[PDB]
From a paper:
In the order Corynebacteriales, which includes the important pathogens Mycobacterium tuberculosis and Corynebacterium diphtheriae, the most important murein hydrolase for cell separation is the endopeptidase [name]. We describe how this autoinhibition is relieved by the conserved transmembrane protein [name] and propose an [name]-independent model for septal control of PG hydrolysis via the [name]–Cg1735 complex.
We thus produced the soluble periplasmic domain of [name] (Cg1603 has no extra-cytoplasmic globular domain) and assessed its effect on a PG activity assay of full-length Cg1735. A clear activation effect is observed upon addition of the [name] periplasmic domain to the reaction mixture. To elucidate the activation mechanism, we solved the crystal structure of the periplasmic domain of [name] (residues 36 to 295) by SAD techniques at 2 Å resolution. The structure revealed an extended N-terminal α-helix that connects the N-terminal TM region of the protein (absent in the construct) to a globular domain consisting of a parallel five-stranded β-sheet surrounded by α-helices on both sides. This domain displays the (β/α)5 topology characteristic of receiver domains from bacterial response regulators, except for the insertion of a helical subdomain between β-strands 2 and 3. The globular core of [name] has no obvious groove or pocket that might suggest a putative functional site. The crystal structure of monomeric [name] does indeed rule out a putative channel-forming property of the protein.
Numbering used by the authors: 46 to 293
The structure:
């Protein structure tokens, strides 16, 4: 008799599921579709980012008409104390021409963001790439060879906006250094023009989390868009809308 109740459960919830998909389809068409036509957007993802969050945001960017400028995974060593010294050395030795590392802020996030920003972004006033294809390949390959980043060969293009998708870390315990370095990294990318959207799950909005740190700084809160609920439907939509805000 238990096959009857499983049948009613499927009947009741299949109606609810179809209703939810219809709502979401309508939202995509009215909010996201066609809003980023021919705009190159690059996606960065931290090591602890949920793959569903990254795949969902990447799908919505494609639905908006954005050009897939590449997906770059920032491995654990990218934001760890252990890897700070070698990361600063790599970005210094492969620094593209026309890029200058900060002489007052010597943290790995600022330097890595200044170097990667020049390698991956377009001049927001002229549209020209900030670095040559050879300079971009050098930095990306040296970073990848040393285990700092992961990406697929020949899929990276210079973009107008970077969407960094983070995890669900509140910046407590040993996650503190990474959370702070991520915020300085995001501000450095934004300081190279163009535009940055940082998206994470709710715990990143803690005062010690990456988004909490960004929002607490008046300059960063005005310059870097932050989405604290990227695992929610409207959080994904707000991320895509924020890309168009950063472009304006
Ligand atoms: Ca900005």
């Amino acid at each position: 008799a238990e096959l009857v109740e499983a049948e009613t459960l499927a009947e009741v919830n299949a109606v609810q599921a179809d209703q939810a998909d219809s709502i979401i389809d309508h939202i995509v068409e009215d909010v996201v579709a066609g809003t980023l036509t021919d705009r190159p957007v690059l996606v960065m993802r931290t090591a602890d980012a949920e793959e569903s969050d990254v795949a969902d945001v990447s799908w919505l960017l494609q639905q908006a008409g954005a050009i897939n400028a590449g997906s770059i995974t920032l491995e654990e060593n990218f934001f760890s104390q252990d890897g700070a010294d070698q990361l600063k050395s790599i970005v210094a030795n492969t620094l593209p021409a026309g890029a200058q590392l900060s002489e007052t802020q010597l943290d790995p996030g600022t330097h890595a963001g200044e170097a990667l920003g020049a390698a991956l972004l377009l001049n927001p006033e002229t549209g020209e790439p900030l670095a040559s294809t050879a300079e971009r390949g050098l930095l990306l390959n040296v970073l990848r060879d040393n285990g700092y980043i992961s990406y697929e060969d020949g899929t990276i293009l210079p973009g107008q906006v970077i969407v960094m998708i983070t995890g669900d870390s509140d910046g407590s315990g040993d996650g503190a250094f990474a959370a702070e370095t991520q915020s300085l990294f995001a501000r450095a990318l934004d300081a190279q023009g163009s535009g940055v959207v940082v998206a994470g799950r709710i715990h990143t909005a803690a005062d010690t989390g990456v988004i909490g740190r960004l929002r607490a700084n008046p300059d960063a809160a005005e310059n870097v868009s932050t989405i604290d609920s990227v695992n929610r439907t409207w959080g994904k939509m707000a991320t895509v809308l924020s890309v168009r805000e950063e472009l304006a």
